[PDB]
Amino acid sequence: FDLNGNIAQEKEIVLEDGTEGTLGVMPILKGTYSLANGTSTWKIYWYSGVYNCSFNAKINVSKGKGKITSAYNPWYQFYSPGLDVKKSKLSKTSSGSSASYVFDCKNKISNWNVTLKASVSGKKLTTSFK
Amino acid sequence: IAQEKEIVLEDGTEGTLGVMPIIDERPLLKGTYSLANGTSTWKIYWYSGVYNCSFNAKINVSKGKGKITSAYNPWYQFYSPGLDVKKSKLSKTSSGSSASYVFDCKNKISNWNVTLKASVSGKKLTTSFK
Amino acid sequence: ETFDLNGNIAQEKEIVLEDGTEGTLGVMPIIDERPLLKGTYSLANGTSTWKIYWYSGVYNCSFNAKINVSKGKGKITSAYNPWYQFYSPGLDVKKSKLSKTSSGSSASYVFDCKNKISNWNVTLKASVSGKKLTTSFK
Amino acid sequence: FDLNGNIAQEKEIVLEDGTEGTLGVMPILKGTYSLANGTSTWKIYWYSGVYNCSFNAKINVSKGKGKITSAYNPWYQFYSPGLDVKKSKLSKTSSGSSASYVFDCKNKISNWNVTLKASVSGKKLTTSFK
Amino acid sequence: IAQEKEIVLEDGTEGTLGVMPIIDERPLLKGTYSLANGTSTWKIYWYSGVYNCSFNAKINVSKGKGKITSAYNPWYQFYSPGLDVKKSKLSKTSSGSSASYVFDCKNKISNWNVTLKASVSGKKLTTSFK
Amino acid sequence: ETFDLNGNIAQEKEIVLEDGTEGTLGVMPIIDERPLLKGTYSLANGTSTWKIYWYSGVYNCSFNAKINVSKGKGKITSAYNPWYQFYSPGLDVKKSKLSKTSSGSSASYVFDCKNKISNWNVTLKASVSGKKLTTSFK
Ligand SMILES: [Cl-]
Ligand SMILES: [Cl-]
Ligand SMILES: [Cl-]
Ligand SMILES: [Cl-]
């Protein structure tokens, strides 16, 4: 039940009030750049008119493959009247494949999360913000 | 057919306490998709006026059977005045049989949850939202 | 006398503290080495899945339970797909949790609730002994 | 710096607004009764016009000394307009010397906790509520 | 004398960042009491118009030195309109050197904590509230 | 150009998402294999206790830190007695936590704050390398 693994496939539905609902599956902007052998420390951050946040990530590249050995020193300043940061959390995957600083936010009309993530694979450091 | 009984609680609340055997789960909406051997990465998502959310699923398939090796990058953004998302957890079963993004919601008149789920069985990938 | 109905079995003690409040502290020996009586009289050998649920004007909730009965003794191997909708103004759900005992003798979906005049928990419970499956909501 | 271990000893202080403060130390109503050899199950409870709560305690008396091996099935119904139960928790000491069901409550003029406790020492079961 | 510096933060906030070496702790109020060899149980408490709380401390003294073997039965009841006790934790140091009952408080105009503490050193039992 | 001042060292990327918001994602290599410079120039050998603190009109907080410096290298063996008073209407403290690094290289007392126009954390930090003790509050 799959033609090509290039486009999104969705199941649609119309709710009792005539509102569309989409259940979908899809195969799959970021910052990436080279690393060096041994251990290194990095400040991973994001800055905008609304969200500003960062943390430190210690990485260790043994052989030609590295991982995040520690994620610490979480900082943040969010400017926006009425915004409520219900929760914030910095965590590292057991493998150390990545670290994420996640904020669960809320205002008068919405609830959502924002995420600053750092990923290490081989000798490559990738960051993202969603 | 199910086996049930009508109970009237002390506070007057009249309800139906029941049990029924099921073959397949009954969500609001579901979808089934075939998988190819090897590792593949997919975005699982739901979009509606009020609820919007997703996560990524890393699926691996050795010969005939496959499972979810990783459920990550949980994202959501809900729009509705006065809505509160008390809790949001993305989790994966130990056997990788499935992953579920569950939201505990609340507002001036109700308390409920919504669930975006992805389960893998053999060559099949099943998505659902309830 | 205010007929507890379990008061005849338990040893109780009326006490009062600091606040000058009057309440009864009590202890009662209970039996667990007993089978179920009211439950769904049958659940075939092997493995099977079940939908446990309570539906009413205010409280609505359910969960799935895979049950495994090898030879004669049956247990719950899993309690999943917790779902709920507690629709009523004034009512607030502060916490919800689905759990299964170590033995798999029972699974409970507990909700911590509150309204303008009270605070309390409610439980949707499924219990299994031998080839019997029973439920309760209190 | 201690005469007799029978009475309370306090350090007093007068706050900026002429309010007394007492820091004190003191050497030290409950329900108690005999147990039997082997394992047993007990319902520990309290009932009043305001607070009603209970839990089950499994006890195991090996030799002539016993302990609580499990505390479970926490139930409660508190009647009082305006009362808010911020938190509730049932826990057992590692040694199993006792179990406690603690409620952190709050209303418009106060914050306090209430506690139903079960204690086992030798072949004796003691309960209390504070 | 202490070593400090006056800092004016970006938002205009003017403060004093300092460090000072101390011999003894400086709480709002303290008390010292002698202990006898053997095990003894004590109630540690504080009473004032607004704050009232206590816990029990099991102290053991082998020949000259002693420590807290157990800090239990935490109790509190605070009176003040609009006051919120966000958190309350009773904990004991691994070495039994001390136990502390800490309350995180809040109201329309302030955020703070209060601490009822008991520390044991040798033959001495020191109580304090800050 | 809006002088970041660290922008010259880090590699940054301006991006935009779903919301149509404009922000800069960035990564910067930093050094930790460096000693302290501004800190309290002395902390004698052996063991000593210190009161770390910040006092101001709105934020006030402090904690104690036992420091152990054997031979030449010094570390924090304990961070205790966390105390605070954040007195200001509109300001809400959502969480507070005192922590010490594994190494004892530093101790941090972090507060999650909020007001009608912003959400942010503030930290009272004590760091120790060799025989140097420094502090900061940002
Ligand atoms: Cl880490
Ligand atoms: Cl029965
Ligand atoms: Cl237990
Ligand atoms: Cl420096």
Please compute Rg for chain D using Cα positions: 19
Length of chain D: 130
How many CB atoms lie under 10 A from the CB of residue F31?
7
For F:79-108, CB contacts with E below 8 A are 81-89, 91-93, 96
The candidate with the shortest Cα–Cα distance to A74, out of F95, C24, F120, C78, is: F120
Q: Give the end-to-end CA distance of chain E in Å, rounded to a whole number.
A: 22
What contacts E55, CB < 8 A, 6 or more positions away? Answer: E43, E44, E45, E71, E72, E73, E74, E75, E90, E99, E101, E116, E118
DSSP annotation of F88: -
Residue from A55, A56, A73 whose CB has the most chain F CBs within 10 Å, to mutate = A73
Question: Which residues of A fall within a CB distance of 8 Å from B44?
Answer: 24-25
A119 close to A126: Cβ distance less than 8 angstroms? yes
Question: Which residues of F fall within a CB distance of 8 Å from E22?
Answer: 49-51, 64
What's CA E97's distance to the chain center, in Å?
13
Q: Is A26 an interface residue toward B (CB < 8 Å)?
A: yes
* Three-class SS state of A89: strand
Pull the structure tokens for residue A118: 């750092």
Question: Which residues of F fall within a CB distance of 8 Å from E9?
Answer: 56, 137-138
Letter string b/e over residues C23-32, b meaning 16 or more CB atoms within 10 A of that residue's CB: bbbbbbeeee
Nearest beta carbon to residue C23 from set D42, D51, D80: D51
Beta carbons of B111 and C93 less than 8 Å apart = yes
Please compute Rg for chain F using Cα positions: 19
E113 close to E105: Cβ distance less than 8 angstroms? yes
The candidate with the shortest Cα–Cα distance to A87, out of B50, F114, B109, E87, is: F114
B19 close to C135: Cβ distance less than 8 angstroms? yes
Q: Is B25 an interface residue toward A (CB < 8 Å)?
A: no
Pull the structure tokens for residue F40: 């309290």
Between CA C121 and CA E99 the distance in angstroms is 33
The alpha-carbon gap from B49 to the nearest alpha carbon of chain A, in Å, equals 7
Residue from F38, F41, F51, F119 whose CB has the most chain E CBs within 10 Å, to mutate = F51
What contacts F68, CB < 8 A, 6 or more positions away? Answer: F46, F47, F74, F75, F76, F77, F104
B48 close to A21: Cβ distance less than 8 angstroms? yes
Q: Is the dihedral of CA B63, B65, B69, B72 positive or negative?
A: positive
Resolved by: X-ray
Question: Which residues of F fall within a CB distance of 8 Å from A41?
Answer: 29-32
Q: Give the end-to-end CA distance of chain B in Å, rounded to a whole number.
A: 22
Pull the structure tokens for residue D41: 């199950």
What's CA D4's distance to the chain center, in Å?
27
Residue from E30, E33, E115 whose CB has the most chain D CBs within 10 Å, to mutate = E33
Q: Give the end-to-end CA distance of chain C in Å, rounded to a whole number.
A: 25
> A123 burial class (0-12, 13-18, 19+ CB within 10 angstroms)?
middle
The alpha-carbon gap from A60 to the nearest alpha carbon of chain B, in Å, equals 23
CA A119 to ligand 4 center in whole angstroms:
29
DSSP annotation of C5: S
* Three-class SS state of F1: coil
The candidate with the shortest Cα–Cα distance to E16, out of A80, F58, D20, F117, is: F58
D26 close to D16: Cβ distance less than 8 angstroms? no
| DSSP characters over chain B | --EEEEEE-TTS-EEEEEEEE-SS---SEEEEEE--SEEEEEEEEEE-SS-EEEEEEEEEEETTEEEEEEEEEEEEEEE-TT-EEEEEEEEE-TTSSEEEEEEEEE-SSEEEEEEEEEEEETTEEEEEE-
The candidate with the shortest Cα–Cα distance to B51, out of B108, B115, B100, B98, is: B115
Beta carbons of E75 and D5 less than 8 Å apart = no
Going by DSSP bridges, is the β-strand pair F22-30/E3-8 parallel, antiparallel, or unpaired?
Answer: unpaired
Q: Is the dihedral of CA D80, C117, D116, E52 positive or negative?
A: negative
The alpha-carbon gap from D87 to the nearest alpha carbon of chain C, in Å, equals 9
The alpha-carbon gap from D15 to the nearest alpha carbon of chain C, in Å, equals 24
Nearest beta carbon to residue A78 from set F30, F94, F118: F118
What contacts D94, CB < 8 A, 6 or more positions away? Answer: none
Beta carbons of E15 and F56 less than 8 Å apart = yes
What contacts B1, CB < 8 A, 6 or more positions away? Answer: B20
List, in order of start, the domains of chain F with CATH numbers. Answer: 1-138 (2.60.40.3860)
The alpha-carbon gap from D75 to the nearest alpha carbon of chain C, in Å, equals 6
